[model samples]
Target chain A: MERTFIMIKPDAIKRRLISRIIQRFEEKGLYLAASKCVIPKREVLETHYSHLSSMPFFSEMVEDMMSGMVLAMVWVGKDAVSIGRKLIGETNPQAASVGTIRGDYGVSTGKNIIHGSDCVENAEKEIKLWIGDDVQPVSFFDKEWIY
Target chain B: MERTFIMIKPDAIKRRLISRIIQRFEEKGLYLAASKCVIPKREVLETHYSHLSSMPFFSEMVEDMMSGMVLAMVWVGKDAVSIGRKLIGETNPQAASVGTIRGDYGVSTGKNIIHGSDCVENAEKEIKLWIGDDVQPVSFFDKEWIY
Candidate 1:
């Protein structure tokens, strides 16, 4: 099974979408391999967004990401990376499709409401960077159905 | 703000992602204008899937849809129709990206977890069809942030 790392950003938590966000994965029949909610460490945020550190909004992003508690998750399914991006829509909310995560809620890429790994290797990389030990490795009733 | 019609099919409810499914829109900052959870009726089912009634799995689909409670909602946001569909992924799970509502949880077209209006006009059409009276036309915290 392919797995993707997803994060519900600080804004979502502040706005109280935690129970609702987690509910989507459970409803979609994905395997919730591991997850944790924490205010990101500076090192972790820096490492996670290292590539974008050169961007003008880098500092703002780091500040926003670390602004509050973020819910990080690993969702394992058939093609995690690609599916994750589709749900996330484009990085810039203005450029995103209307109903997508970014399109629906995000106003600026700097303050986007969530994030998902862009590719398989990235998923693995980010998962290691972000969700190292905080997760529940359990099976579900419809586990076989998805695979 | 624009509105889109989305429905959590029977399997999604049976699997119990009501809150999760609702959460995507909530997280994306969409406003939940109206909602209802109920078992679909025969005539409504027929009308909803009239295009598929000629298919071989018609009766089975009706049974499955009517088998349990389904959550239908009207989400208001800047491009609710488009964003909602993107979050939902493609109609066929196999073709959907992993993180999408379908890609993450759906395994079959017949039993895909959720449905969203394909266009602006259709959203208006389906919302009326499914959510007849059980709705709350209120507002939320991030209304301006999205639209």
Candidate 2:
């Protein structure tokens, strides 16, 4: 099964778009493996984006992220990466498609309302960063279909 | 107290944006007076948008709305009309601000993701339409603050 990491940024939480956002993923037939609402500590944020730690906007990014709660989630399904990307849209709102998550809700690149890992390797890394290695797998029957 | 009626459209429900959306209103310090997730019948949709029943797209609109489940809500607060509008944002995503709900999650005008009563009168009309006149009000205490 393919898995991906996704986060709804602070602005989305503040705007009350959480349900609407999550509903999109759900409708796409993605199974929500795990999720939470958190205000990540500096250390967690630093570790999550360690490669960007030296960037000029690193501090600003962290500060904006921590300003309010964020909803982090792990979604699993077939072709999760491509599907997640499709759901999330492009990194820049200006370049995103009309049907994409960012294209629909976001206005700027910096304050993009959501984030998703760009590739499978990054999805694994990002999931580790937010949910940790010990996170348990979720199991449930699709009773309606099989039973 | 001012009350506004908001409905998380079927698309929003299908997208799983409910929890996050509800949390937004809760965080904004708005009281959720009533809420329900329902697969509304055509009759309910007809009554809910009765004022627009004679419009050309009325049947199509109702059919689209009845296509899935919707979250109906009653939000009460001071100046709820203005505050609710601010939270929902402009009806069109292109015109919405970066911080508003529609600005963050909506894409198409047709599938705009949500609906909120524009005025107090409309709020009452909507509430009565979706929630019958016999419905009872609920109360709760906020221990963190004196109300």
Candidate 3:
């Protein structure tokens, strides 16, 4: 099994699409190892999106994240990282597939509504950066069926 | 805002309905103050459903609850208890409304897929029974609009 980091941005929460987005993961048989909602700290957002620091919208992007509460979660499943990205779709909503999370609920590049780790390495880093490194594995009773 | 206890049962977890059930509350503009997934303890179930101890299906019910991971949550909204129960539908799925959580996902009485507090008092007791007594208030960024 593998684990991936998925975050529901403040825009999604404000639009009340948190459950809708989470349902996409749950229905795909991902086990939620950990979850919490909070107004993310500015420092954390800076680090999480540090790669985008050189972009023109970097400061505004971080400010937007701090505008509301975001839902952070760790989900476990087979090929979790790969699958999570597919579920989240492209960062630009217009170019994303129609059935994906971003495709379905996102309206623009700035308000794509969800984020997933790009790879196993980033999954580890993002999970630790956002929710800490103490997330323990979750055991689901229906694992046999899902596997 | 009022806080109410909502639980997604083992059957729902097994069927991967956690997100769908949670979506109902979020789309209703309810705030998810707290949430966790766990296999409930036997003692806790006994205390939680003690009123059902006199029934014939008591033991089986407790065992079923312990059979898998259940999602427990605290949702805050106006008249939360009443709204939650209405959204959950009747105890029996067949008698539940077409748009209710049970009505859409539940199959039988034994596998109703979800549970909500019957009233405010019970909501308080059940929140303590399932998660703990330390649940703190959650402030949402869009609370002004929801209220």
Candidate 4:
């Protein structure tokens, strides 16, 4: 089994898209390992996206994320990384498939409704960065069946 | 401001009716005070519907609620009790208005996809019961403008 991190960015939260976003994961049989609504501190956002710190748009990305609350989640399942990308679709909604999350709810790249870890290593890094270490790792017994 | 409690039942969750159900509240511009996905213990369910404890179908009702996880929520707004009821429509989907939550997603009384508080008093009671005292109440500044 693999685990991935997903976040419904502030724009999606302001658009009241939490339930719809969660429903997509649930319908796809992904086990919701951990989830919460949070307003990420700039420090946390910086750490979460540390690898992208040198990107030209990093500052703008950080500003946009801090605009409102974000829904952060850790989901677990087989092929989680690939499956999550498929569900979230292309980073740019214009090129995203019609039924994918971005394709359905997003209209642009800058305000794309959701984000998912692009790799397993990034997923682990993100989960820890956002959720912190003190919280016990929760495991649901039905994870296999759910996935 | 008045507050109301609503539960999107398991049937609604399984059938992916969240978007349709939330759209009703979103379009109305009601503030979502709190929400959680929970599989209630029997005792909690009993307490929630204690007023119906003497009714013949009380046990059955509790059993139905315990069958799976439900999306429970607290909504705050003017005349929330009445507005929520109207949004949920009649318990029987066949008789509910076409534009309402039930009419849009429900197919039968047995599986009428949602539940809403019937009065302001019950609303307060239900919200406190489901969300508990410790959960932080949600308040947003632009709620009036949205409405």
lDDT of 4 by residue, A7-116 (tens): 98888876777668877886687755555556679999898888889999999989998887676777777898899999999999999999999999999888999889
> Model 1 fnat?
0.27
A54-114: candidate 1 lDDT, tens digit per residue: 8887887788787765667788777767877887789899999986777877797777788
lDDT of 3 by residue, B67-141 (tens): 877878889888999999999999999999999998998879999989899889999998888778787667665
Could you tell which candidate, 2 or 3, scores higher by lDDT? Answer: 3
lDDT of each: 0.75, 0.75, 0.85, 0.78
DockQ of each: 0.12, 0.12, 0.51, 0.19
Identify the CAPRI category of the predicted complex in candidate 1: incorrect
RMSD of each: 13.3, 12.7, 2.9, 4.2
Better of 3 and 4 by lDDT: 3
Q: Pick the candidate with the highest DockQ.
A: 3
What TM-score should be assigned to candidate 4?
0.76
Compute the DockQ of candidate 4. Answer: 0.19
lDDT of prediction 3: 0.85
What tens-digit string does per-residue lDDT give for candidate 2 at A1-147?
Answer: 788988988777656566678768776777666665456789999888789999999999999988776767787777888898998888899899998888888899888899888889999999888877854443322324422
Q: Give the distance in Å from residue A127's predicted Cα in candidate 1 to where it truly belongs.
A: 44
What's each prediction's TM-score? 0.51, 0.52, 0.85, 0.76
The sequence of per-residue lDDT tens digits that candidate 4 reaches over residues B47-69 is: 88888899988888888887766
